[PDB]
Amino acid sequence: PPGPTLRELWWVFYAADRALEEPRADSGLTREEVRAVRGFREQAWKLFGSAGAPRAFIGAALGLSPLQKLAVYYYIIHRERRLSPFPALVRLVGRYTQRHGLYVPRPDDPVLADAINGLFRDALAAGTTAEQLLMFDLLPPKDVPVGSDVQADSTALLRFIESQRLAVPGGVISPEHVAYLGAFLSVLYAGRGRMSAATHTARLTGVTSLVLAVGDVDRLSAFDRGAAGAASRTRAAGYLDVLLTVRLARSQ
Ligand SMILES: [Cl-]
Ligand SMILES: [Cl-]
Ligand SMILES: [Cl-]
Ligand SMILES: [Cl-]
Ligand SMILES: [Cl-]
Ligand SMILES: [Cl-]
């Protein structure tokens, strides 16, 4: 069974930051597990930055720490095998639990299911936008700007959607698709929300259906049942995995 589980995500989501703010946090676990928490914190900064230096990336309007975003990020991907850093994180939370007690989320803490659904809808909005764009192989002419990180993200998403055969087999990824999806992502990577990104992209492209498509995303949840709920969980896992591979390659 691929990890991480909802229980594992819960312990890390609500107490990993509070556990790291304790002096003897690593005194409970081993060296190989320190090295696992090491890379997890490294990638959290490489993807989302700091609480004071936040990078522009997906899940920007969720009000989550970089560790909380990354934990939700891996749970949606749901491909942690035997080399997962989560048991090291759980044992870190366990040691904090032995010292300062069990931490219960306060009434103004992030809601876990909303944190999952927010990142899950962000991933579906980007993919469903790239899907709507590829349905038109001719759009108002634009060129991809010179130095935009959203170019690498947008290109990888469009190429991945061709591999999924969600777009009609035969179409071409034109520079208009790369540029207009990058405009959606640049807005989405702010705190503007999916609707503000869909409407702004629909203004530029003229794709009228682009707004209602993102609206149907908001009618979905990462906990839906049946083949439909699993099909959306697969899309969100793929899109987030596509953006993850790019962001980790450009950071090296
Ligand atoms: Cl689970
Ligand atoms: Cl931080
Ligand atoms: Cl949301
Ligand atoms: Cl067309
Ligand atoms: Cl292929
Ligand atoms: Cl913007």
Swiss-Prot record:
Coiled-coil stretches: none
Membrane spanning residue stretches: none
Compartments, as annotated in UniProt: Virion tegument; Host cytoplasm; Host nucleus
Function: May participate in DNA packaging/capsid maturation events. Promotes efficient incorporation of tegument proteins UL46, UL49, and US3 into virions. May also play a role in capsid transport to the trans-Golgi network (TGN).
Quaternary state and interactors: Interacts (via C-terminus) with UL16.
Family: Belongs to the alphaherpesvirinae UL21 protein family.
Designated name of the protein: Tegument protein UL21
Organism the protein comes from: Human herpesvirus 1 (strain 17) (HHV-1)
Residues of the full protein shown: 279 to 530 of 535
